[PDB]
Amino acid sequence: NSAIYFNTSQPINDLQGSLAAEVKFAQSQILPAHPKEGDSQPHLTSLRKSLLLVRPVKADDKTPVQVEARDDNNKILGTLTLYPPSSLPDTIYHLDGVPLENNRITYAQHIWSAELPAHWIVPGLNLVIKQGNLSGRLNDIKIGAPGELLLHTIDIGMLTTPRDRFDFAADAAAHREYFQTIPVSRMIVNNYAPLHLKEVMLPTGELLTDMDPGNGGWHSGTMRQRIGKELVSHGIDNANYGLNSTAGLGENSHPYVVAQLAAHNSRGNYANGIQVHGGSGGGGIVTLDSTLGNEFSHDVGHNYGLGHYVDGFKGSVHRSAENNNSTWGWDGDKKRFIPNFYPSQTNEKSCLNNQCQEPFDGHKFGFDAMAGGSPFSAANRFTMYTPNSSAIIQRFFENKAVFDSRSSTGFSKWNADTQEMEPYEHTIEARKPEQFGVPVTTLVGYYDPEGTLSSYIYPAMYGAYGFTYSMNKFHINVPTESQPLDTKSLTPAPEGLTYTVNGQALPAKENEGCIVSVNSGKRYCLPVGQRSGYSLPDWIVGQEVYVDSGAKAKVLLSDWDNLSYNRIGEFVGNVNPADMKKVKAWNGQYLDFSKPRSMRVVYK
Ligand SMILES: [Zn+2]
């Protein structure tokens, strides 16, 4: 017994030409080239590596399939030679050993595949697919904004020590696992040092010690709101926006211009004991008890503009291929599909408001993460969003501005009319960061502007990545590099504060020059006036790389160890591997610098 195919649906042609083929892309999920009538699916997100699935209407698993990609200007981007149906990526339930029958599962039969680089996924992209003498064109590809998510993590102890159970924050792989489920180009997970509050001061001017006089719970308690949410979370969000002061009561003062969320763990001593907070999110905040699984995907989901049971059954239940709201996930690092069903054969149906989705070969179909869904396996510790929710999440990111160090305003926002990221003016009067994603010391507390009395500065909060600038609530970001009716001596920041970047690597700064791994996105940066050691670090040597040079900088590369034999190539701006292969060197010849061995960063 062998081969159990998920998608047995009749392929519909998506091309204009000789070749009849169905086309699918795959980022945070498998998405169609042409969505069916009444189906809600996300479209391609700009600047994110995409799988390309080609299913010829008239099957041919033998004749080589090729893809020629062209940009808006009709310049050939590249040519790919697809993998035969036999080489189609497996499920994450597959095991290595040739004769636990999940290994039989395969997405579909007769599907050809390739990987389209991130820099191709930009509005204007057109494909020409050829299968021998046959050819077809896909020239109406919808590509959305390169969406961004900035997520802060802090563990708050309120009249107690921090819980120390923020699994997500302590696990880099979880940041990566979550990135696979959402339709963004870039995700930054910023670590804040845990906050310990032995005393708690309220905007009413009431100092607490020992316990909050009211009751607390999962969704309640005064501290949970005033401190956990407004002071800490909206404090971190507001400081990054440059707002020096806001009211000590309320959430409306938060501008929420960028998709910036401050996720926390909060527990405090109340008049009914130590109460752990959780189960909520919105307006740039996340109150998490469980930081992995459904609670994370739901709470964060709320920040994307989502409610509960989005669009009833049609929108909330994961479906088989003959239906709408049907898809499978994609793990772009593992190079494997994430099926929308549990690995166990329980023969259970998935129902909502009486409607049901029948199981796939015994496997129970999942659930949106705003309708009580849960991860399928430890392969991805997060809940898969249904195509309907994923489409809403995508629209949400596209409509948000982005912190952008290369922008004249420090911000960029998508122009749906010109199909490009354009500068966005942030208003406090114009407000622009002096420093971008630098370590930060977030100073926080309350002050009485009229006086008489009770102004209180809280202990300094320390972040790995933030933005710096030149009763009421104060929230100011100071660069940690500086070293730090009330006065308080500020403790220096602890050591190991680190942020994570998933997807698109961060851009090179003004007087900086990088080479970046096409695979991992891990950068090797040097400032202007600096060179590498004798040879580049072992990790980057032999790797497929792109150059990212700052406005005031120039990148010098050699294909030899030490910038030797005058075999130096000059790279300015953003240069891709294909444009690193025939570059004129200082020694008057054209050389390949696609696998460099030494580097130097100069001005100009
Ligand atoms: Zn909810």
296 CA from centroid of ligand 1 (Å): 10
Instruction: Scan for tokens 């998510």, then name that residue.
Output: 149
Q: Which of 462, 488, 504 is the last residue of a domain?
A: 504
With b for 16 or more beta-carbon neighbours within 10 A and e for fewer, the 386-410 pattern comes to: bbbbbbbbbbbbbebbbbbbebebb
Instruction: Scan for tokens 């995907």, then name that residue.
Output: 297
Residue 47 CB coordination number (10 Å): 21
Distances in Å between the Cα of 35 and the Cα atoms of 5, 56, 141, 326, 391 are 21, 17, 11, 11, 12
Domain count within the chain: 3
524 CA from centroid of ligand 1 (Å): 41
DSSP SS3 for 48: coil
Do 354 and 404 lie in one domain? The reply is no
Residue 392 CA from chain centroid, whole number: 16
285 CA from centroid of ligand 1 (Å): 13
**67: CB partners within 8 A, 6+ apart:** 52, 54, 79, 80, 82, 114, 116, 127, 128, 129, 130
Any bridge partners for residue 601, and if so which?
A: 555
320 CA from centroid of ligand 1 (Å): 26
Residue 169 CB coordination number (10 Å): 24
295 CA from centroid of ligand 1 (Å): 9
302 CA from centroid of ligand 1 (Å): 6
Do 376 and 416 lie in one domain? The reply is no
Q: Do residues 455 and 485 make contact, with C-beta atoms less than 8 angstroms apart?
A: yes
369 CA from centroid of ligand 1 (Å): 10
- Is beta strand 273-276 parallel, antiparallel or unpaired with respect to 280-282? unpaired
60 CA from centroid of ligand 1 (Å): 47
Do 373 and 472 lie in one domain? The reply is no
Any bridge partners for residue 402, and if so which?
A: 412
Instruction: Scan for tokens 């109340």, then name that residue.
Output: 270
Do 325 and 176 lie in one domain? The reply is yes
218 CA from centroid of ligand 1 (Å): 13
Residue 592 is part of which domain span? Answer: 505-604
293 CA from centroid of ligand 1 (Å): 14
Q: Do residues 497 and 193 make contact, with C-beta atoms less than 8 angstroms apart?
A: yes
Q: Which of 442, 474, 504 is the last residue of a domain?
A: 504
442 CA from centroid of ligand 1 (Å): 29
301 CA from centroid of ligand 1 (Å): 8
d(CA 603, CA 529): 8
Residue (of 410, 150, 333, 369) closest to 258 by Cα position? 150
464 CA from centroid of ligand 1 (Å): 29
Q: Do residues 31 and 24 make contact, with C-beta atoms less than 8 angstroms apart?
A: yes
Do 381 and 408 lie in one domain? The reply is no
d(CA 543, CA 580): 13
- Is beta strand 435-447 parallel, antiparallel or unpaired with respect to 545-549? unpaired
Instruction: Scan for tokens 């790995």, then name that residue.
Output: 464
Given resolution (angstroms): 2.5
Do 163 and 67 lie in one domain? The reply is no
DSSP SS3 for 4: strand
Instruction: For residue 423, count CB atoms less than 10 angstroms from its CB and return exposed for 0-12, middle for 13-18, buried for 19 or more.
Output: middle
For 196, half-sphere exposure in the C-beta direction (CA atoms, 13 angstrom radius) is 8
126 CA from centroid of ligand 1 (Å): 40
Q: Which of 467, 482, 504 is the last residue of a domain?
A: 504
